[PDB]
Amino acid sequence: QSTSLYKKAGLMYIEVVKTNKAPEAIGPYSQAIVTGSFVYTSGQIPINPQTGEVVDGGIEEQAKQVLENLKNVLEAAGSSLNKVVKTTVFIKDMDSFAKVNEVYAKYFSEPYPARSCVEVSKLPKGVLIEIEAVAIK
Amino acid sequence: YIEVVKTNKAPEAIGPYSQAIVTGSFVYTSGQIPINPQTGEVVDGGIEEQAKQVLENLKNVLEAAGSSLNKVVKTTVFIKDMDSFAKVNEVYAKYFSEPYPARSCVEVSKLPKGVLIEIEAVAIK
Amino acid sequence: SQSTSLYKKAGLMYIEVVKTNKAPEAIGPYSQAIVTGSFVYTSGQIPINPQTGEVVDGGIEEQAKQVLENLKNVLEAAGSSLNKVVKTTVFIKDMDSFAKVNEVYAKYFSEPYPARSCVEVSKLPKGVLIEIEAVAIK
Numbered sequence: 001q002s003t004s005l006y007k008k009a010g011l012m013y014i015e016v017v018k019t020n021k022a023p024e025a026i027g028p029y030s031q032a033i034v035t036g037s038f039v040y041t042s043g044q045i046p047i048n049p050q051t052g053e054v055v056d057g058g059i060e061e062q063a064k065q066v067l068e069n070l071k072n073v074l075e076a077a078g079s080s081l082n083k084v085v086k087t088t089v090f091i092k093d094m095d096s097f098a099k100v101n102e103v104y105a106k107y108f109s110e111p112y113p114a115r116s117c118v119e120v121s122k123l124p125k126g127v128l129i130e131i132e133a134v135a136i137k
Numbered sequence: 138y139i140e141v142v143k144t145n146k147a148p149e150a151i152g153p154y155s156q157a158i159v160t161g162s163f164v165y166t167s168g169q170i171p172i173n174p175q176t177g178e179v180v181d182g183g184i185e186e187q188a189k190q191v192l193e194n195l196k197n198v199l200e201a202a203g204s205s206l207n208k209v210v211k212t213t214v215f216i217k218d219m220d221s222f223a224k225v226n227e228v229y230a231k232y233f234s235e236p237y238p239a240r241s242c243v244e245v246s247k248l249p250k251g252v253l254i255e256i257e258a259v260a261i262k
Numbered sequence: 263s264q265s266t267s268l269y270k271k272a273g274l275m276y277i278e279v280v281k282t283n284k285a286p287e288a289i290g291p292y293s294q295a296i297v298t299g300s301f302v303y304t305s306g307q308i309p310i311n312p313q314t315g316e317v318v319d320g321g322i323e324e325q326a327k328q329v330l331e332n333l334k335n336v337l338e339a340a341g342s343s344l345n346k347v348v349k350t351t352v353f354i355k356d357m358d359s360f361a362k363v364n365e366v367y368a369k370y371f372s373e374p375y376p377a378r379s380c381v382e383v384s385k386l387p388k389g390v391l392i393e394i395e396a397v398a399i400k
Contacts, residue, residue: 005374009346009399012300016374028368029378033348035399036300037161040349043379085139085158086165090381094247105153111141115154116168116257118215119247122357122382132351132379136139136160162275162299208272210296211303219385230291236268236279240292241306241395243353244385261272261298 012036019076022069023047031073034137039079043090043132044069045124054125059096062128063103070131071107079135084113090130094119100129144201147194148172156198164202164260168215169194170252184221184253188228191256196232204260209238217253219244225254275299282339285332286310294336302342302398306353307332308390317388322359325391326366333394334370342398347376349397356391357382363392 007014017032017039018025025031025042032041046062047069048055055065074080091100097117113133123130142157142164143150150156150167157166171187172194173180180190199205216225222242238258248255263281270277280295280302281288288294288305295304309318309325310332318328330344337343354363360380376396386393 007345007372007374009342010300012399014346014348014374014399025375027364028371028375029350030375031377033374033377035348038348040377040397042377043381083139085160088379090379094249097249101152108153111139111158112150112153112155114156114158114165114167114257116213116215116255117249118168118245118255120381121246121384124357124360124380130379130381132377134165162272204272207270208277210277210298219387222387226290233291236270236277236296237288237291237293239294239296239303239305239395241351241353241393242387243306243383243393246384259303261275261277 017073017077019072021049021072021076023049032077034077037137039074039077039135039137041070041073041133043130044073045127045130054127059099059128060103063100066129066131067103067107070133074133074135078137081107084133084135086114086134088132089115089117090120090123092120092123092128142198142202144197146174146197146201148174148177157202159202159262162262164199164204164262166195166198166258168255168257169198170249170255179250179252184224185228187253188225191254192228192232195256195258199258199260202262204262206232207234209233209258209260211239211259213257214240214242215245215248215255216242217245217248280336280340282335284312284335286312295340297340297400300399302337302340302400304333304336304396306393306395307336308387308393317390322362322391323366326363329392329394330366330370333396337398340400342400344370345372347371347396347398349377351395352378352380353383353386353393354391355386
């Protein structure tokens with residue numbers, strides 16, 4: 001729960017983001033890191049933070065939860081959805097990308113982030129979507 | 138701050154993304170795909186022709202940003218078939234010069250519009 | 263060539279190459295890592311033994327170790343380290359194996375841990391089971 005640990009490299013620092021509004025980072029990663037004026041998030045997955053479980057439903061419900069989780073990590077970093085410069089969207093099914101897109105479009109507006117979108121063979125816990133972001137503070 | 142690249146020399150960004158974003162001295166491109174900007178269609182041919190189109194799109198995106206291929210620091214190359222790696226590499230090597238960008242190459246299951254290759258770049262300005 | 267004298271210039275910023283014979287040689291149109299400003303970008307490290315030039319013998323534990331040693335030595339050649347990594351992407355051939363990868367990975371990083379994305383892909387170079395790239399600071 002503490003975010004007071006940092007690393008120093010000369011004039012720059014690595015600072016941790018921790019928030020209970022997104023799934024806890026268990027093991028050797030952080031929800032997000034702040035360094036310079038950059039925020040690097042972990043690839044968010046559709047786990048409901050008030051349960052530890054993947055959300056009920058399908059791609060539309062998973063996409064929403066991923067983006068909520070991304071929102072809360074970003075805002076906990078002092079950043080926001082509108083300061084995202086680049087995402088990678090990893091999906092289990094490219095054929096239903098229009099459905100992911102329809103949810104995604106609700107979370108961002110002009111200027112939209114740069115983006116890469118690829119179909120992967122599996123994701124953590126069998127989820128259908130994972131999204132990481134680079135953002136500015 | 139944040140600046141959006143919107144160049145008519147690469148395929149238009151339709152939907153909730155941008156061709157590239159410029160923030161300070163850094164340029165983040167979208168994952169470029171072998172779409173002909175003049176037709177909006179995938180270019181004809183196989184991996185060689187698609188790799189070329191992707192790198193032409195990348196070039197034009199980067200240049201419209203005020204960057205270029207020679208200021209690329211990192212790329213990710215997503216390919217549909219790792220067995221055509223050597224062909225990709227031969228085309229790729231035409232577009233970059235020493236010191237070459239850092240790079241990751243992975244084979245994926247599927248790419249937008251059934252393309253065989255997609256490439257993103259982080260560059261400087 | 264082991265020389266690191268070539269750069270690219272972009273106004274007041276520079277792209278500088280990282281080379282070390284302690285990691286597999288970058289052969290072809292890429293570099294082991296690139297240094298620009300206060301950032302280090304590594305290539306996706308694969309479990310090649312820099313001595314033999316071949317994929318290490320053994321299984322996922324051995325491949326995980328080799329990838330992370332390769333990344334260690336690339337970073338250190340850049341004047342950076344594992345301790346200065348801000349973001350990794352871990353591409354694996356088998357998500358079901360991920361606890362074993364995690365167990366090895368955990369030995370190479372300290373708090374605050376890098377941000378991370380982990381995905382399973384359909385194939386990696388030379389049929390390796392894991393590839394890891396990093397963004398670090400110097």
